[PDB]
Design a protein around this motif. Sequence first.
Motif, PDB file in Angstrom:
ATOM      1  N   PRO A  35       0.816  -1.226   0.000  1.00 24.78           N
ATOM      2  CA  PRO A  35       0.000   0.000   0.000  1.00 24.78           C
ATOM      3  C   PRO A  35       0.848   1.273   0.000  1.00 24.78           C
ATOM      4  CG  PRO A  35      -0.835  -1.594   1.611  1.00 24.78           C
ATOM      5  CD  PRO A  35       0.505  -2.094   1.153  1.00 24.78           C
ATOM      6  N   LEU A  36       2.164   1.112   0.116  1.00 23.33           N
ATOM      7  CA  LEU A  36       3.101   2.212  -0.042  1.00 23.33           C
ATOM      8  C   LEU A  36       3.335   2.512  -1.521  1.00 23.33           C
ATOM      9  CD1 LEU A  36       4.382   4.006   1.883  1.00 23.33           C
ATOM     10  CD2 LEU A  36       6.459   2.620   1.841  1.00 23.33           C
ATOM     11  N   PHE A  37       2.362   2.157  -2.353  1.00 21.26           N
ATOM     12  CA  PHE A  37       2.461   2.394  -3.784  1.00 21.26           C
ATOM     13  C   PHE A  37       1.774   3.706  -4.134  1.00 21.26           C
ATOM     14  CE2 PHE A  37       2.116   0.884  -8.339  1.00 21.26           C
ATOM     15  CZ  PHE A  37       3.466   0.604  -8.496  1.00 21.26           C
ATOM     16  N   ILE A  38       2.354   4.430  -5.085  1.00 25.67           N
ATOM     17  CA  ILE A  38       1.784   5.671  -5.582  1.00 25.67           C
ATOM     18  C   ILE A  38       1.386   5.466  -7.048  1.00 25.67           C
ATOM     19  CG2 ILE A  38       2.540   7.867  -6.511  1.00 25.67           C
ATOM     20  CD1 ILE A  38       1.338   8.015  -3.719  1.00 25.67           C
ATOM     21  N   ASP A  39       0.267   6.024  -7.501  1.00 26.23           N
ATOM     22  CA  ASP A  39      -0.023   5.975  -8.940  1.00 26.23           C
ATOM     23  C   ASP A  39      -0.611   7.280  -9.473  1.00 26.23           C
ATOM     24  OD1 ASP A  39       0.739   3.177  -9.764  1.00 26.23           O
ATOM     25  OD2 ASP A  39      -0.744   2.682  -8.228  1.00 26.23           O
ATOM     26  N   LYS A  40       0.261   8.216  -9.854  1.00 25.80           N
ATOM     27  CA  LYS A  40      -0.135   9.574 -10.223  1.00 25.80           C
ATOM     28  C   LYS A  40      -0.856  10.253  -9.059  1.00 25.80           C
ATOM     29  N   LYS A  41      -0.529   9.809  -7.849  1.00 27.96           N
ATOM     30  CA  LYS A  41      -0.940  10.485  -6.631  1.00 27.96           C
ATOM     31  C   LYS A  41       0.282  11.257  -6.154  1.00 27.96           C
ATOM     32  N   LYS A  42       1.425  10.887  -6.726  1.00 25.70           N
ATOM     33  CA  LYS A  42       2.683  11.613  -6.599  1.00 25.70           C
ATOM     34  C   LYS A  42       3.666  11.054  -7.628  1.00 25.70           C
ATOM     35  CE  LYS A  42       6.374  12.022  -4.217  1.00 25.70           C
ATOM     36  NZ  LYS A  42       7.429  11.866  -3.176  1.00 25.70           N
ATOM     37  N   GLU A  43       4.931  11.455  -7.528  1.00 21.27           N
ATOM     38  CA  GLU A  43       5.980  10.895  -8.372  1.00 21.27           C
ATOM     39  C   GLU A  43       6.782   9.896  -7.546  1.00 21.27           C
ATOM     40  OE1 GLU A  43       5.218  12.321 -11.083  1.00 21.27           O
ATOM     41  OE2 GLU A  43       4.611  14.368 -10.626  1.00 21.27           O
ATOM     42  N   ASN A  44       6.663   8.610  -7.879  1.00 21.22           N
ATOM     43  CA  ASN A  44       7.266   7.547  -7.064  1.00 21.22           C
ATOM     44  C   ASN A  44       8.770   7.714  -6.838  1.00 21.22           C
ATOM     45  OD1 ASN A  44       7.963   5.069  -5.732  1.00 21.22           O
ATOM     46  ND2 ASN A  44       6.229   4.047  -6.706  1.00 21.22           N
ATOM     47  N   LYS A  45       9.283   7.048  -5.805  1.00 19.73           N
ATOM     48  CA  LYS A  45      10.700   7.125  -5.448  1.00 19.73           C
ATOM     49  C   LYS A  45      11.614   6.723  -6.602  1.00 19.73           C
ATOM     50  CE  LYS A  45      10.303   8.580  -1.273  1.00 19.73           C
ATOM     51  NZ  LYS A  45      11.304   7.832  -0.473  1.00 19.73           N
TER      52      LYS A  45
END
Lengths: 419, 416
Positions: free
Chosen positions: A19-29
């Motif tokens: 759940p530490l995944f981002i999807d165009k909710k930010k720019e991933n690490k």
Amino acid sequence: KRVFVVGGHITTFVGKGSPLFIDKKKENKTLEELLAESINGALQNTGLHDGRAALVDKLVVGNFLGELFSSQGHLGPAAVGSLSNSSAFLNKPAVRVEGACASGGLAVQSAWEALLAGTSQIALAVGVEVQTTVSARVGGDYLARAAHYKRQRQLDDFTFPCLFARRMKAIQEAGHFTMEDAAYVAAKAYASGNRNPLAHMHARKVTLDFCTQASDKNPNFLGNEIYKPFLRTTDCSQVSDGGAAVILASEEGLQKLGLSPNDNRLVEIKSLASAAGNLYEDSPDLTRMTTSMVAARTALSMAGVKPEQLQVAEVHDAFTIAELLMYEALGIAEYGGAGALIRSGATALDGRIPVNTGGGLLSFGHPVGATGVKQVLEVYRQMKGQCGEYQMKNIPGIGATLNMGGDDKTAVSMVLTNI
Amino acid sequence: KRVFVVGGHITTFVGKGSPLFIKENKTLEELLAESINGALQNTGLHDGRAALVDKLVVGNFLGELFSSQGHLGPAAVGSLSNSSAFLNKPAVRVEGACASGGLAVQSAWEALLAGTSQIALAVGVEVQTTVSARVGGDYLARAAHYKRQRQLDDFTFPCLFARRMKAIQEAGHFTMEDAAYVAAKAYASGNRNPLAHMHARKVTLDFCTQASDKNPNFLGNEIYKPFLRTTDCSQVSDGGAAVILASEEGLQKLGLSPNDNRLVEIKSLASAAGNLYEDSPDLTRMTTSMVAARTALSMAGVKPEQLQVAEVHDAFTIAELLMYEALGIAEYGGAGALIRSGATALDGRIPVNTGGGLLSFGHPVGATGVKQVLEVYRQMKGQCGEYQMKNIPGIGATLNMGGDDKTAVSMVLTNI
């Protein structure tokens, strides 16, 4: 001639399923950031976090892929780069190594080599990877850079897990272990990953009856419609970003640290081997991994360590099926029986030799190049008491590692003795 | 503590411009097949006497997309096939953009003094003849910030110098005309080398200058575009370059001694890496190579003016002119003058890139690193042929490049 471990910080591992995944909710690490977290914290543990960096003699990068995962290589001087009064460090030797999956242990080997040589006195090794970029079937196309793409791509767009998906049936055509023995692995592994805070697949665990077949939420997914059913989702290790850096030193280097080969913070290493086998030819023993055996019975034999005296191990199992061919090379167990001594509790955190206690490549994370380094730090955290939660009361002064390369085409193993 | 060179064979380098261009072209699996079987052959071993090579290092830079395949460590273990017995020996792959070769040798160098190995091998190789030329540079930006340096052009790699081409014209160190006497000289030296990529070509100096069209620029940075030529771009070239190394301890099994008229010793070897998140404020300087130089030879205290023959990893003529400032054989404030003192030519003080260099010899990114160490070996023992210099040395040097001077490897080869 003494190799030491003095610290190293491991990052949070991410991907789909975490759940530490981002999807165009930010720019991933980014890989630039993934190494930023990995080394600044690797320094911090060690008695240095400022200009006291300027004493790190050798830098080794154990990255396997980034030429397309981040469309960028030359990660040697990239390690020199990511410090930014915190950028002064430059103009020190730095290499990047690759060995498919064992890219980490090979990196440590480079500093290991750099140590005894007098090339360097205090060195650092750093593993990292970024497999969370785009398509999953496309990612395996970039993992076939471990085997004959010219001879092993005309199989499927999922050609990598097929080496074992065929070994999955090759072993069922044998009396060494069953498909049911490949089930008690994941649940156990997924469980150990539930104990680890920074685990990729931390927030999941199911019944053994589900890590077996008769499932659908965790089935296969392949295309080799005859070797397709011969794998599960419980077998595929984790597509995972994450770094894992480590600082190493010499007895000669120890004097400047203000330490001695006694300190209750360090772990020594007196045995380290490596091996590589032909990839133009695959094993005639589909029921065996040979390259790891050399890296084992040759390594510890330098320290003459009796494998039954081993207390805690970590292996680079790309798959549960590969995990069951580990203890045959790592001489702690033997041949003719695999899926039995595992339920002797000689794999569990409350038994003889707990292996992959953080979850392993199934739940801890598999950043191809950071998986190599992390084990050396996975037997360090328990031998000194830093794992936390999943820390074993069973206390050791002896450890071991096992790195994998392709289809057992490269292997790196170690012996960590708490001197 | 003694590092030696005992041999090594270099392959034919190919590409567009070399009539040896194609059938199904030579593969990376084959490119390493030629490179090592011949590297063994020179050395007193070509059969089961392989089983004594303790360490294997691979200096490949790209293959994950050039051949869509990596893990070249055990690939070196593979390509022998009574000739396949060799297996289960340590083998790594290294990368440092262009200096991938010198880094490989560094690994065996490190492996030597450590006691990891007694007799080791290093092997450089590359395959840039696969597909599109503007696409190939997209895969060479894996040496610099693709995130910060790709929004320039589809030809973003030669721009670091195409901008340094104007940055230097805005200076009194050297001119665009000084970058002309390089290629002709280099292309000429490549005409002397049999296996040279651009062997069958050589033009007038007035053509390696501007006022040309057959050899102009080709970029897209329409303001830095005119500030390069085709004479500057090093050669998109396939080709391997392998080498065997040994120890004094290893020497006893060879039936040799640190005297033999076939070996060359090495007592100085350094390396360096600078930030690539930041480019040089001295666009008129390469700093990482200087460390790898003035630190290396200072271990052997070699006076640079005593140097007799050099080899440099000039990605460009413009980079070639920033070599002798790091390699302390020359100094600063003047570059395009001492080159016409004949201190670069095969008939002078210090002939550099005598086989043609990266402009005509070939630039297989990972094999360019290793070959220099063998380019000063062949002349120090007499194997270059044709382009062999009567000016005989007992002292040599190397210079490897990484990105925009973000990685450097240099050596000192003394004929002990």
